[PDB]
């Protein structure tokens with residue numbers, strides 16, 4: 001469901017790329 005506990009998955013590693 002949208003963002004998830006982990007991120008960084010050839011999907012949003014750029015979102016929480018921090």
Ligand SMILES: [Hg+2]
Pocket residue numbers: 006007008009010011012013
């Ligand atoms: Hg991700």
